[PDB]
Each structure stands twice: as structure tokens, then as C-alpha cells.
């Protein structure tokens, strides 16, 4: 998150920090959503790699003890079938984790929610990222969770010339482009918060930003539309 603050301890209990084994220790690498006790959504380009991979949950600051931490390995992933390493562009940037045990449900640890489907947010809805990424272009990764917030672009404003152009599909969820604020490296994979009715929802899971750099102006973060998901995802944990 470049631009952003440092969240309080229990603001975003959803959140979850993705990490593979490095050595004899872990790396984190990803954010992702706790959607069941035993599941967690998050973005398909984060587990190319064929990596031992851990869940935390209850985390907020990434190398010290916060005394509410659960730890769970992974036991199974499935990867949205149309998505292409080769082809971000093109969508799917999407995955579901199996955890080895369900965790346990806190004041640090919830569920997050999901929109319903074909749901589509107006112009300059009010959003926030989070996540552990990097906190300036070719930067560091953060310590603590951050937030910045993020109002969406619409899709007809996101794909003209001076935006993204064809490279954002409907399938997707722009926000930002300011300049100043912005998703950047290690944030993939994480939530979107999007404040609908009272209420706050994932409604994007990070996807990419510019090869420019993090935060360009009329260059917004780029998200995988949740709502467009909703029928994939349920099929998918009604089987497994
Ligand atoms: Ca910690
Ligand atoms: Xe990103």
C-alpha cells in the first residue's frame, strides 16, 4: 500500500497474510479473505509457483508476536480453470485455499462478505485497500497492516485512452489513480472494502498495477470483480 496509514488491530478481522517456507522460515507473499473457517479467497497469479504454503490469521504486525495469530497450512488450492499466467489481462485472476483445520472465530478472526452477484458499483464509490505490500514503487514491504482509500473509477472511465484502455475488462473493478495512493507489490490477492448499505463488503481481490510503477496518476489499481465469481465460488466449496 503506498500512501496509506496503519490500520487498527481489529478494523479489517477478514485479512488474512499468505507466506511460503523459505529456508526454515516463512516469507510472507499475498493477502487473501477468510470466507469460511476452513476457506480463503484470493488471487490465482499468487500461487503459480509450486510453493509450501501457510495461512495466517489474526496477524497485524508481520515479524512480532501479537498474541492472536492462529496458523494453518493449506491442503488443497483450486484455480479459477480459465485463468493464464501469461494473460492477467485477460481476468480470472482468482483462487480458493482449503485449510488443513478451521480456525477459530474472534474479534480478530471473521468472515468476510461477499456482494451479490452481477452487482456493479457507480462512480467514485467510497473503497479502502489493505495489505502488507510494498509501501513505495520497488520500496519495502510493510510491517503492519496499512489502508488507503480508494474510490472506484467506473468501467467506462477506466478503459478510455488516457486510462487503461483495453487492457481493463468488465470482469474487473478499477480504483484510485490519483498519483499519491495506491495497491503496489505484496498486496495482491488481498480485499477491496467497499462500503454498500451500511455495511463493508469485498467487492475486489488485487490483481496489478502499472509496470510504470505503483502509484501513477490515471493509472488506478487494477481488482478481480468479486460479484462477478459468486456462482464459481460457491460451486466450488459445495464439492470440496
Ligand atoms: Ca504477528
Ligand atoms: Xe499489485
Request: with cysteine; aromatic share 8%.
Amino acid at each position: 500500500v503506498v500512501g496509506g496509514t496503519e490500520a487498527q488491530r481489529n478494523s479489517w478481522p477478514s485479512q488474512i497474510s499468505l507466506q511460503y517456507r523459505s529456508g526454515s522460515s516463512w516469507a510472507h507473499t499475498c493477502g487473501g479473505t477468510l470466507i469460511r473457517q476452513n476457506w480463503v479467497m484470493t488471487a490465482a497469479h499468487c500461487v503459480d509457483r509450486e510453493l509450501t504454503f501457510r495461512v495466517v490469521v489474526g496477524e497485524h504486525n508481520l515479524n512480532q508476536n501479537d498474541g492472536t495469530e492462529q496458523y494453518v497450512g493449506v491442503q488443497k488450492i483450486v484455480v479459477h480453470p480459465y485463468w493464464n499466467t501469461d494473460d492477467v489481462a485477460a481476468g480470472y485472476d482468482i483462487a480458493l485455499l482449503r485449510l488443513a483445520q478451521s480456525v477459530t472465530l474472534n474479534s480478530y478472526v471473521q468472515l468476510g462478505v461477499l456482494p451479490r452477484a452481477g452487482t456493479i458499483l457507480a462512480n467514485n464509490s467510497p473503497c479502502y485497500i489493505t495489505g502488507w505490500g510494498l509501501t513505495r514503487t520497488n520500496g519495502q514491504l510493510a510491517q503492519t497492516l496499512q489502508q488507503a482509500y480508494l474510490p472506484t473509477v467506473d468501467y467506462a472511465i477506466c478503459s478510455s485512452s488516457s486510462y487503461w484502455g483495453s487492457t481493463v475488462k468488465n470482469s474487473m473493478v478499477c480504483a484510485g489513480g490519483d498519483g499519491v495512493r495506491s495497491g503496489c507489490q505484496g498486496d495482491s490477492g488481498g480485499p477491496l472494502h467497499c462500503l454498500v448499505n451500511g455495511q463493508y463488503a469485498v467487492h475486489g481481490v488485487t490483481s496489478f498495477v502499472s509496470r510504470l510503477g505503483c502509484n501513477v496518476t490515471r493509472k488506478p489499481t487494477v481488482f478481480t470483480r468479486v460479484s462477478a465469481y459468486i456462482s464459481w465460488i460457491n460451486n466450488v466449496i459445495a464439492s470440496n
